[PDB]
Amino acid sequence: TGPIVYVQNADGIFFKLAENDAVIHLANQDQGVRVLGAEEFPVQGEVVKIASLMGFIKLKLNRYAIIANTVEETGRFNGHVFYRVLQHSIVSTKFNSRIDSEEAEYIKLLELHLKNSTFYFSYTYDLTNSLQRNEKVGPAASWKTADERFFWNHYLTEDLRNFAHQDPRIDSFIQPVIYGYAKTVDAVLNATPIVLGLITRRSIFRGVDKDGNVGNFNETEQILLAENPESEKIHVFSFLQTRGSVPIENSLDATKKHFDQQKELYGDNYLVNLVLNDPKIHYVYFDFHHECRKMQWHRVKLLIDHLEKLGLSNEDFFHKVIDSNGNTVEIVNEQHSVVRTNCMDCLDRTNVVQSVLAQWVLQKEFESADVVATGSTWEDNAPLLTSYQNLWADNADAVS
Amino acid sequence: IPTLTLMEEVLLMGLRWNDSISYALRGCIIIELALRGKIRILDDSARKRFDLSERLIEVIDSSKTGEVLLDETLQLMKNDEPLSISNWIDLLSGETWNLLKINYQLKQVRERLAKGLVDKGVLRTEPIADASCKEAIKRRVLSVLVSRNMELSYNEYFPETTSFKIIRTLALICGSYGANVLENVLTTLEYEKRDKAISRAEEIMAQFSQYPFDLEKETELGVSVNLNKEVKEEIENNPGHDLQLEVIAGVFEVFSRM
């Protein structure tokens, strides 16, 4: 994948990779997307350089183009760079005085949807899946291999998908984009250079829907990198924690399919709710009882201990070790259990529980790499703690 | 302080709706807004490297004019980044591709100007009620396009106390010819007089499309002589208004690109 530039012409718009060469022409005659060579690329005309192309959307008789003007660096991890879409742009082949009044409403609502929305992506990395799932996939494939649930621009690239099934040059054009959060933080604990990071993706689909989807499914991943000159190796962690609705209307078959998918993708599932008898599926309930904030944190700790008593371990995460170049040395551990959080009223509670859980696992991630001592509390370090808190705070700011 | 806006005058000369008349109408909107003293060219040295029509727009006053269209354009200029003249008029005409500013295009301008003229008691719905005004404006236009020495006439709508009267008339001529609606008020004239008038308007276009518009240029036509002297006598008044004049000459530049 790479940057894309284009030329605006009356007959149609001509896209082309910024770096043989494939040209993506959206003609104005039939509003259809077709592939042309570099010779078709206009010698003169306005050359617009953009970050990435989201795809095309067709309403009524007109097909519009969704393009990202510019992006800002939001995260860097093992060379892979995360980008946030600052400015969005919708472009049509027809002039504003030629656009139908009915379609203007649709463009208005769409533009409204694009506002107050944070999109993230990366050229050399597919964030659509977890690092665990990304590791199970070869380094060659990119567009072909992406989570069906978190590939936000799936519909917009349907034509592009169809043209990519035949032409491999189209694969470089299409770029995975996720809705949620994605950022990294540089820090240091016990004289060890460390790079924390967090991702959060919202599902496309959608109680339990008849298809099996539960709706509001937000996969929140917590990744980490640790370089220690004492061990001559680079450690990479990838804790995972999803959330969303919970089956309680809800079909038996739909519940079965849902649970089968959840157990096939995430293995063990701990479902916590806030106010069949499947062995690999546990139901947890929790009430804050309107205590003080400190007492609430304490209650969260107690809930964590309860989950620990249920069989959940703080050692169950994705641990791997790579080489100086980036290639993995060996696979240490895989995560076979997730904790799904479901809440009533304010959604902030979910983010809170996910935060405290993620730190409770984070301590063990630290212990596993000999960064901290056994039984030691990582939370004693103020800068790392406030960096963590800032990260989760901004995550909460993005989710809402 | 004129009664009739430039756009309403142009439209009035129009009848006896192309794209030219619309483009020119928006052009008249920018021109009028500049004449009011609302907008002005940003005092930058770098912008003078490009063409005058590509220069940015800076609004100073926020007071409403009373005219719906002008105030709408003022609103559009109030909440946006400084855009160039040509791009502004293009957006107001809805000729740019971006959908972000799709709401910038003015819809149904004809009805706006119609209600404007009717509520002013000039237009009757059943067809002008007062033909003396139209004939007076036409008299001015012909006084600029035919007369050996330029002399001006004034009505209640366009008094003698009106600021930049000569500029109003010239902008009217340029804007009207931009829409090719000037052909209607040259019908009465003889063939030769028309032939002189059109190229005189061409000279006006070519001379005032740049800033500062040269006045040392002596016309070969012998039509509207001492135009440069009277224009000088206009620039003797209202000093520091060079910005607005840059805007106007910019719009004149736009008219020559239609």
Side-chain angles (χ1 to χ4, degrees), chain A residues 1-43 45-48 50-53 55-59 61-107 109-182 184-232 234-248 251-255 257-260 262-293 296-400, chain B residues 1-15 17-18 20-35 37-39 41-48 50-63 65-77 79-106 108-110 112-123 125 127-129 131-164 166-189 191-217 219-225 227-258:
Chain A
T1 62
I4 308 98
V5 299
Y6 70 90
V7 175
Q8 177 65 249
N9 185 24
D11 297 329
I13 312 180
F14 303 92
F15 295 87
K16 187 180 183 301
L17 291 180
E19 183 180 3
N20 200 332
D21 301 328
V23 169
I24 305 301
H25 182 202
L26 176 58
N28 191 26
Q29 292 77 7
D30 65 330
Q31 298 293 333
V33 181
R34 281 171 263 92
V35 175
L36 299 179
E39 69 285 347
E40 302 276 62
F41 194 84
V43 180
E46 171 81 321
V47 180
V48 180
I50 45 91
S52 178
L53 173 61
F56 304 96
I57 175 178
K58 182 179 183 178
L59 291 179
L61 298 180
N62 296 338
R63 176 171 297 178
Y64 309 94
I66 312 300
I67 315 98
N69 293 334
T70 179
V71 290
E72 62 178 4
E73 175 176 326
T74 177
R76 167 164 50 252
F77 215 77
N78 196 24
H80 306 263
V81 184
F82 302 149
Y83 285 141
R84 181 196 185 277
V85 180
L86 280 176
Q87 307 298 332
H88 63 263
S89 61
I90 315 178
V91 179
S92 61
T93 57
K94 304 179 183 301
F95 301 96
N96 300 331
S97 57
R98 279 73 177 177
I99 304 179
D100 182 31
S101 178
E102 294 180 343
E103 296 185 357
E105 303 169 343
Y106 295 163
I107 302 176
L109 291 180
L110 178 58
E111 178 66 24
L112 177 60
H113 272 174
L114 300 186
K115 287 186 174 62
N116 299 18
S117 302
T118 62
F119 302 95
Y120 296 83
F121 80 104
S122 180
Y123 290 93
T124 63
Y125 178 77
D126 183 39
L127 309 90
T128 322
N129 301 85
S130 64
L131 182 56
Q132 185 175 208
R133 297 194 296 263
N134 291 130
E135 186 66 27
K136 299 177 182 179
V137 176
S142 62
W143 166 83
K144 295 258 187 175
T145 59
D147 200 328
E148 187 80 0
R149 306 167 302 176
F150 309 106
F151 195 87
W152 186 265
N153 52 326
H154 191 259
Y155 181 34
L156 303 183
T157 64
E158 176 182 356
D159 315 273
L160 292 182
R161 293 193 303 104
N162 301 330
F163 278 89
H165 290 175
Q166 320 270 19
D167 201 327
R169 301 176 302 177
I170 316 298
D171 298 331
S172 182
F173 273 85
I174 319 176
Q175 174 67 32
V177 175
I178 62 179
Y179 194 6
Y181 195 88
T184 63
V185 170
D186 294 32
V188 49
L189 181 58
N190 299 332
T192 299
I194 197 177
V195 179
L196 190 54
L198 193 143
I199 322 182
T200 293
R201 301 174 288 265
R202 179 173 294 102
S203 61
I204 294 169
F205 317 102
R206 189 178 171 98
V208 168
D209 186 70
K210 310 306 174 183
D211 301 25
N213 299 117
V214 85
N216 301 328
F217 189 84
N218 300 337
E219 176 168 335
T220 62
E221 190 176 7
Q222 183 272 113
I223 46 98
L224 182 56
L225 191 146
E227 300 190 25
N228 196 27
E230 303 175 356
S231 61
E232 304 284 86
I234 297 91
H235 299 174
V236 182
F237 296 85
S238 176
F239 175 71
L240 186 56
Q241 183 177 185
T242 64
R243 63 176 169 183
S245 179
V246 166
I248 31 75
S251 177
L252 303 179
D253 186 34
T255 303
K257 293 175 58 182
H258 174 53
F259 282 162
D260 286 330
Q262 291 287 325
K263 288 183 300 181
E264 234 293 326
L265 294 179
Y266 301 145
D268 233 319
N269 287 75
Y270 298 94
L271 286 72
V272 48
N273 307 272
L274 307 177
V275 180
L276 177 61
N277 275 330
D278 191 277
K280 302 181 64 61
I281 297 166
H282 305 71
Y283 286 94
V284 191
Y285 298 88
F286 178 79
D287 188 33
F288 292 83
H289 298 78
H290 315 325
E291 297 286 342
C292 180
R293 294 182 183 174
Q296 286 181 358
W297 280 80
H298 185 198
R299 280 186 173 271
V300 174
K301 292 185 177 61
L302 298 188
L303 179 55
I304 290 181
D305 296 328
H306 181 273
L307 294 181
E308 185 181 15
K309 293 185 299 181
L310 286 178
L312 173 62
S313 62
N314 45 11
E315 306 178 10
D316 188 38
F317 48 84
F318 184 83
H319 189 189
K320 192 184 60 178
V321 176
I322 63 180
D323 194 87
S324 59
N325 67 333
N327 288 129
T328 172
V329 172
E330 62 174 354
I331 306 178
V332 177
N333 192 21
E334 299 179 355
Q335 181 175 359
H336 304 274
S337 63
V338 300
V339 182
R340 295 175 53 182
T341 311
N342 179 83
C343 185
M344 180 63 178
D345 281 321
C346 47
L347 183 60
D348 183 33
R349 325 281 256 198
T350 59
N351 182 84
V352 170
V353 177
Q354 287 183 334
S355 178
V356 187
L357 207 165
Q359 87 179 12
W360 178 66
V361 180
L362 183 65
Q363 188 171 351
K364 300 298 298 179
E365 297 181 15
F366 289 161
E367 293 184 359
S368 59
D370 303 332
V371 181
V372 301
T374 301
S376 60
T377 303
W378 75 273
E379 307 173 6
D380 297 331
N381 187 271
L384 184 60
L385 181 59
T386 188
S387 301
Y388 184 85
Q389 292 172 347
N390 286 334
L391 185 60
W392 278 93
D394 287 336
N395 179 84
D397 293 334
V399 172
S400 299
Chain B
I1 315 177
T3 301
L4 299 180
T5 62
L6 197 63
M7 62 213 67
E8 293 179 357
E9 293 182 355
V10 171
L11 181 63
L12 197 62
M13 305 297 260
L15 50 81
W17 185 280
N18 300 122
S20 60
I21 192 61
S22 299
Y23 208 156
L25 274 178
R26 275 70 166 183
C28 288
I29 297 176
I30 280 81
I31 285 183
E32 185 72 20
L33 286 182
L35 253 45
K38 301 310 186 68
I39 68 180
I41 295 295
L42 280 170
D43 201 334
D44 180 29
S45 62
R47 44 146 250 270
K48 307 189 67 177
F50 282 157
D51 293 333
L52 177 56
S53 57
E54 288 182 332
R55 300 188 185 176
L56 278 60
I57 300 299
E58 175 193 14
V59 51
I60 309 298
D61 197 339
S62 302
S63 182
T65 57
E67 297 286 345
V68 189
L69 300 177
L70 293 171
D71 292 331
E72 286 177 1
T73 306
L74 189 62
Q75 171 84 354
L76 266 52
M77 295 187 175
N79 313 330
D80 204 338
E81 59 178 350
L83 302 166
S84 62
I85 306 179
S86 60
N87 187 265
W88 258 118
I89 315 178
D90 283 21
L91 282 175
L92 291 177
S93 303
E95 302 296 309
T96 323
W97 285 287
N98 69 84
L99 307 188
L100 172 61
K101 307 172 182 178
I102 191 181
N103 51 331
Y104 283 6
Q105 178 181 345
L106 304 179
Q108 197 53 241
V109 190
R110 183 176 182 178
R112 301 298 196 88
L113 300 174
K115 293 182 179 180
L117 295 179
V118 171
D119 293 27
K120 281 178 180 180
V122 184
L123 179 60
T125 66
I128 56 181
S132 59
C133 177
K134 179 181 180 180
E135 193 71 17
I137 296 180
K138 180 181 179 181
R139 190 197 313 171
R140 306 201 315 265
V141 176
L142 296 185
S143 180
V144 186
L145 292 180
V146 189
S147 178
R148 218 279 180 170
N149 284 326
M150 177 179 56
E151 190 175 0
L152 305 177
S153 299
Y154 313 94
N155 48 18
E156 185 272 343
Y157 307 92
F158 198 73
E160 189 177 353
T161 62
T162 301
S163 303
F164 296 109
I166 306 180
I167 311 300
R168 294 273 181 177
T169 307
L170 291 177
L172 179 60
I173 297 178
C174 299
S176 58
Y177 177 71
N180 200 28
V181 302
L182 186 59
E183 308 288 342
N184 298 272
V185 296
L186 271 301
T187 60
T188 310
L189 275 71
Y191 167 79
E192 302 87 337
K193 311 181 71 175
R194 294 192 300 262
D195 183 31
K196 298 178 181 179
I198 55 173
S199 297
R200 183 48 179 167
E202 288 181 358
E203 288 186 350
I204 296 179
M205 286 294 303
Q207 181 177 0
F208 295 87
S209 295
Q210 317 86 12
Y211 195 88
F213 18 80
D214 182 29
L215 301 175
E216 299 293 331
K217 189 58 173 297
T219 174
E220 308 170 347
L221 315 185
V223 177
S224 66
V225 198
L227 174 61
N228 302 329
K229 196 193 77 63
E230 298 298 329
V231 161
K232 280 189 60 180
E233 196 162 341
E234 288 287 341
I235 76 179
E236 298 302 327
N237 295 86
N238 309 270
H241 290 70
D242 297 337
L243 301 76
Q244 294 87 339
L245 274 308
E246 290 188 9
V247 180
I248 300 309
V251 191
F252 287 169
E253 182 179 13
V254 176
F255 289 151
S256 58
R257 308 281 176 80
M258 303 176 59

